[PDB]
Symmetry: D2
């Protein structure tokens, strides 16, 4: 036998950083969870008990903290690029660094209508993430995403005209609930290295904001023919608004809310136009995916 692929590192590294403005007293906090996995000429650690090729995962952890101390942690695309570049430059035999960052929300509190200088709220479990793959000789590949954005619309979703055969029981509808947890990813053009990533830094926060805004507005305003049709509209708009993105991918569950027929009880009418009370279904769920690129 032989090693065909290998990577190793430290996962689930929780990191907080604070910035304190001396002049104003305003503090700003950042919290993330980081994973770094390395690849390179490491196969002998597996095949021959050769630990000399292993940068210890404990040392990878230390390096995450040190890097956070000495560099910006925002935008996460930048932090991940700095961190991954460090490993492939520092260690001759390490040839790729795969950096995943989950950013947690700490939104500044408003108290009596004024932003508070040092108090924050987790206003959502929605995350902003990056996957940064730094590959020696092949630049930096970045996938940015938002996930855990949970939404519901109570009308202006439809689903009719689907295939009907002997496996089909679903009734056509022209008015249903639609609820999902949005997972949206935008894949950047390959960057040649850290200098190029740094040259585009403002685009990272701007493109996250665009993706989020397009997602919410399109969800809210599209009289949806299907999850498929609505998500495609989101992707096409994001591509039209950032030329440095190559593809946009959505993965959307259809979190079903079922009508409840109560007519067996005193003729109570709770279906169709009279539907008021529904049963949210925990499982199963539709799962709809697509990757959209440029024509």
């Amino acid at each position: 036998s032989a090693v065909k692929a290998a990577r190793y590192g430290k996962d689930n590294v929780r990191v907080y950083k604070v910035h304190k403005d001396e002049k104003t007293g305003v503090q700003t906090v950042y919290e993330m969870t980081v994973c770094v996995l390395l690849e390179g000429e490491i196969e002998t650690s597996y095949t021959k008990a050769d630990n000399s090729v292993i940068v210890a995962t404990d040392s990878i952890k230390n390096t995450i903290y040190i890097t956070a101390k000495q560099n910006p942690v925002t935008p996460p695309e930048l932090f991940g690029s700095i961190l991954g570049t460090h490993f492939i430059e520092k260690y001759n035999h390490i040839h790729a660094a795969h950096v995943n960052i989950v950013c947690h929300r700490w939104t500044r509190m408003d108290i009596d209508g004024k932003p508070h200088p040092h108090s924050f709220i987790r206003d959502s479990e929605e995350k902003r993430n990056v996957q940064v793959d730094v590959v020696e000789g092949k630049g930096i590949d970045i996938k940015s995403s938002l996930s855990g954005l949970t939404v519901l619309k109570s009308t202006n979703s439809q689903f009719w005209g689907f295939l009907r055969d002997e496996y089909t029981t679903l009734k056509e509808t022209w008015d249903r609930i639609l609820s999902t947890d949005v997972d949206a990813t935008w894949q950047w053009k390959n960057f040649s290295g850290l200098q190029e990533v740094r040259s585009h830094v403002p685009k990272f926060d701007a493109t996250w904001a665009t993706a989020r805004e397009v997602t919410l507005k399109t969800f809210a305003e599209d009289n949806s023919a299907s999850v498929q049709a609505t998500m495609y509209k989101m992707a096409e708009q994001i591509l039209a608004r950032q030329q440095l993105i190559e593809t946009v991918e959505y993965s959307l569950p259809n979190k079903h809310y079922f009508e409840i027929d109560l007519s067996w009880h005193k003729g109570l009418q709770n279906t169709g136009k009279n539907a008021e009370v529904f049963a949210p279904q925990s499982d199963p769920n539709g799962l709809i995916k697509c990757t959209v690129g440029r024509s």
Copy 2:
């Protein structure tokens, strides 16, 4: 042997309800998870296989839906009181109904600075809950709460002057991070029945808002001597602002953020006044509780 206590019912009943304003087109959604457990002259179901005394848990589920269809589901204190009253009135042999409701957030979306008529976001996993105990001949006992309100302040928390002995390693501090998940409960005066609950309906949303506002403002503004001292201030203010509450209870974890000494690496200074990068600790956690009443 003999039955000393018994209760039974249906848990984890997910319920959605929509209201549609015909004139304006504005829709409003409510989602909760409901548990109803009944007590009464039911011991023979346990001791003699006497199912005649059992209102089936499936029927309890049906009744939750029917009640939601025919009554307001908001405020949850009211819905729970209506629901619990139903069981003790409908069934001679059922003498108590214990209703727990967890309310999930569906906050109306703003799109282009305008509230959208039928689109919503789960803007937090924070919950609003009630426990409503309807006991035949003994009125209605209501505990209202908020939970899962996750906050962090980056300074203006202290902890010094605690007991120091041979088990103590903790260093005194005059400047630390404080983060918690707030669980706050206000216990209402006993209500004589449904009429009295209904007579106080506006106070339920108003008192939830007061509790939340006091919690956030006190957290943000108190230069905290301890979790103990800060939570007491919250409780005393809530009692002062709603005379129909008898007690306020807080349960607060101290979700620790530890400094990271990096001085072993090139003399990097990251402790005390120089602390920027911290290690959030998943466990263990302090857990601080108190119940405050009127003197």
Copy 3:
């Protein structure tokens, strides 16, 4: 206002301990999660910022480790009693210690039909727990439990003869699936102190084993009239087999498995006597409870 109740301490303290037999080489591992909350003359920490009365929660954590180092961690009833006694004896002003222990399974592996001296498997998420309340002047109150014991029987469960009215849709059945997650608690006679707890040490593991065995055998063998009737049989047997228990409490979800009518598809018969494929329901669930004592 005034403090009506208060307790505080450290939660979620993970603890592992190993025993190494020098002669045989056999190692044995224990892992638990511990919570200790203290009560006493501590109100001024809440009302006056008086930290002098606070045994720091960090120190409580240290004390858990130290106590585990110097004493047996098994049975958990004993460890919790030692730990709680320490706090009320060491600190004049601390008058109660509430110790919760969750014990995690590390079952010795068999390799090639032989017990391995130092390798273990988590063979279940089933837990063994204790709640030990040590109250100065009032002895030691112990509740022992097993939880997370997940079982299913595919027949020999029935449910008929329940109340039927205008809220009832459930069909009577003489053959259904029954599945639950067992949470069973046995409450010991008050012990006067540590000496008395120690005098009964062998009874703790023996009574846990009895409770588990009775639960499994009764579940498997009872042609169940209801969850109520079956759980009562379990409780009565446990009381009959340990005189030092005062009560036994069960809390059992009825984790429903629904038939699926497939007759709309080519007349396929999958209900009643022909039921083969079922839909496990995540929610809602029946929840059935009782506390049984001696007549």
Copy 4:
């Protein structure tokens, strides 16, 4: 823009099936969670609101139940192959079906030393899984796995000789705890279709058993130089014992257990050879991966 990739279907479909032997009375249960995602000439559902190409996800759900009713659900490699083949054969325009199955444990209970005919226990959260990709014109690709197999050894793990530089603080060790959650995958040779899968049916359960046995024995017996070295030994043995496997992949967290220095308290010795009480660390964790193939 244009669709570059798309798939859709139903996730989180819970399925139970019972087999009842009429002669013996012995019943046997199977429970799984199924996901089916389809690909094909479906792009117009995304780009033109063309639902005519959509086999409804509700219909996919129905089809899972129907298929389970009319075919074996074990081994999961077979069920997934039957299910995926159905979709690509039934629907001209569907060209791939991706079937994921998670199998849940229901192990027959022993009562008084005898296997019970219809009572079962969830004896572990360990799962057995398959990913079956049925691609029209390109056969059936199967990845089998076990996951959630949680183990610990208390000695006979080492880690020394790793790279040491200015980022390194980790001390070399010749005796540490090693604990992990095993995720192991074996990738089968491409099968030409259902007939070929069926021809190898006994190999599926046999190879799962081999993988599990090799994992446990190697974990228990290897005086481990690193997670890397130990996992490689497991993979090489599995490849040597099933020629129809092409690769074996492991993904192993290193779930750290840290020593606790207690020497600050009365000189208590709890490190090195005296280490008895440890602090299990929830995060971060090492994460070690490799894919092994034939030389």
